[PDB]
Amino acid sequence: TIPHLAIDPFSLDFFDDPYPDQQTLRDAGPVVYLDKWNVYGVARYAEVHAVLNDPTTFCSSRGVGLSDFKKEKPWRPPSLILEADPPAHTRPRAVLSKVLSPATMKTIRDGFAAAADAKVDELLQRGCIDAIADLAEAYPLSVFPDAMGLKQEGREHLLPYAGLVFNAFGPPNELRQTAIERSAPHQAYVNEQCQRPNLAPGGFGACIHAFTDTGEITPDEAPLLVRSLLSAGLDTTVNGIGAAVYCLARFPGELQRLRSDPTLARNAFEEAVRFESPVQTFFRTTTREVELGGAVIGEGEKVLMFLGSANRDPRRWSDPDLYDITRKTSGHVGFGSGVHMCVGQLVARLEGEVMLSALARKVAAIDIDGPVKRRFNNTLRGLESLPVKLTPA
Numbered sequence: 144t145i146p147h148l149a150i151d152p153f154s155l156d157f158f159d160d161p162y163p164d165q166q167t168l169r170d171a172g173p174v175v176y177l178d179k180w181n182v183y184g185v186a187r188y189a190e191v192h193a194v195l196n197d198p199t200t201f202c203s204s205r206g207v208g209l210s211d212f213k214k215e216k217p218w219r220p221p222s223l224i225l226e227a228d229p230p231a232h233t234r235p236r237a238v239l240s241k242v243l244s245p246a247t248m249k250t251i252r253d254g255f256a257a258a259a260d261a262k263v264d265e266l267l268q269r270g271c272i273d274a275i276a277d278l279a280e281a282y283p284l285s286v287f288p289d290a291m292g293l294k295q296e297g298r299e300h301l302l303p304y305a306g307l308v309f310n311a312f313g314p315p316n317e318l319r320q321t322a323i324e325r326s327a328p329h330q331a332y333v334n335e336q337c338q339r340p341n342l343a344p345g346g347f348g349a350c351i352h353a354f355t356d357t358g359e360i361t362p363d364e365a366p367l368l369v370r371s372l373l374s375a376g377l378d379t380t381v382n383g384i385g386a387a388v389y390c391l392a393r394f395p396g397e398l399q400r401l402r403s404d405p406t407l408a409r410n411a412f413e414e415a416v417r418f419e420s421p422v423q424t425f426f427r428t429t430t431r432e433v434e435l436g437g438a439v440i441g442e443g444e445k446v447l448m449f450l451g452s453a454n455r456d457p458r459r460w461s462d463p464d465l466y467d468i469t470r471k472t473s474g475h476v477g478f479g480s481g482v483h484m485c486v487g488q489l490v491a492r493l494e495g496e497v498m499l500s501a502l503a504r505k506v507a508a509i510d511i512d513g514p515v516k517r518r519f520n521n522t523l524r525g526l527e528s529l530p531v532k533l534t535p536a
């Protein structure tokens with residue numbers, strides 16, 4: 144009853160252009176079986192949303208990558224939040240929610256905005272830049288490690304560590320094997336920075352450790368929760384901001400609308416998150432036999448959720464392949480949905496908003512003026528190099 148497909152959603156050919164294969168996955172049926180990796184797949188909005196919002200049946204504690212923690216050893220100690228189910232998930236989640244809370248955004252917004260304005264000013268002096276290394280990477284590197292409270296030395300490990308984390312959600316292909324092979328110095332750096340004495344006062348890391356006396360987390364839980372922010376907090380925003388600049392470079396009509404009303408900056412970023420879906424996929428594991436669509440999935444099966452496909456499903460979205468900065472984006476699953484929905488979404492949106500605001504106010508044109516190069520990762524979608532000419536307003 145369930146169609147079997149040979150599509151490999153973790154192949155370089157798929158990463159290079161996923162959209163035809165994602166339509167094939169959607170149109171084959173509400174639930175597919177991917178023979179390449181022996182997992183179920185859901186690529187329509189409806190089933191992705193349903194799976195995300197039933198954490199009891201579609202659990203996370205057996206891993207949200209291909210590997211089943213009941214069968215294989217995790218490559219690193221499980222995340223106390225991402226790779227936990229209720230009730231164990233609940234108090235670590237509440238702590239990170241308060242650490243990255245609406246009130247916390249007020250303390251960092253002025254500095255994040257000034258750094259975004261300063262970066263665009265700097266880039267406009269050069270004119271021809273790489274919007275990945277010089278903007279999408281450079282701006283988050285200029286605000287997020289400091290907001291964490293990290294020392295300066297060793298920050299070159301942060302993007303490699305995150306690339307490793309997101310590759311390690313994938314199947315055991317070359318991208319994953321190579322990442323793990325090179326992982327030891329990056330894990331050593333990251334694990335050391337998670338310890339309380341190495342996190343500067345007032346930053347996100349110190350605030351996590353400060354929550355260890357409320358009864359929500361114990362002291363021995365704080366390093367792994369810092370680890371979660373050092374895993375998820377930087378590379379995601381790099382590819383979110385890169386996606387937004389890539390969209391504005393490809394759709395100049397939308398750059399023109401954004402210039403005319405810079406208060407569209409926040410929704411222009413949100414639409415970029417829907418349109419590119421920097422985090423493409425996550426897995427769940429069934430805790431029981433379950434009916435989904437019309438298929439009966441057995442217990443202990445991996446289910447691959449295509450977040451990017453769900454965000455382009457024409458059953459849910461009008462003109463899904465169009466970048467529209469005034470679109471009603473509410474309900475997109477680029478940040479997830481339900482109990483695990485991105486706890487750092489306010490940081491991500493703040494960074495994206497203030498960068499797009501700086502562009503909206505300072506830049507008249509963004510023209511691709513060099514070869515575009517894609518960056519390949521088992522979970523992240525984004526570019527390696529995006530040469531652009533910035534024309535000042």
Ligand code: HEM
Pocket residue numbers: 203207224225226236239243371372375376377379380382383384416420421422425450476477478479480482483484485486487488490491
């Ligand atoms: C454009 C930027 C980002 C995107 C697209 C993104 C994507 C996601 C997604 C899809 C999930 C759901 C995971 C699941 O359902 O299994 C998630 C969760 C999470 N994100 Fe974000 N993320 C972004 C930025 C950030 C930032 C900036 C931080 C921290 C500062 C962060 C920290 C986390 C954490 C800790 C979780 C786990 C939450 C939980 O399991 O309850 N993320 N993210």
Ligand SMILES: Cc1ccc(C(=O)O)cc1
Pocket residue numbers: 222223224225226308370371372374375422
């Ligand atoms: C997207 C993402 C990646 C890693 C983590 C973590 O807890 O390590 C959380 C969320």
Ligand SMILES: [Cl-]
Pocket residue numbers: 219330333334
């Ligand atoms: Cl690690």
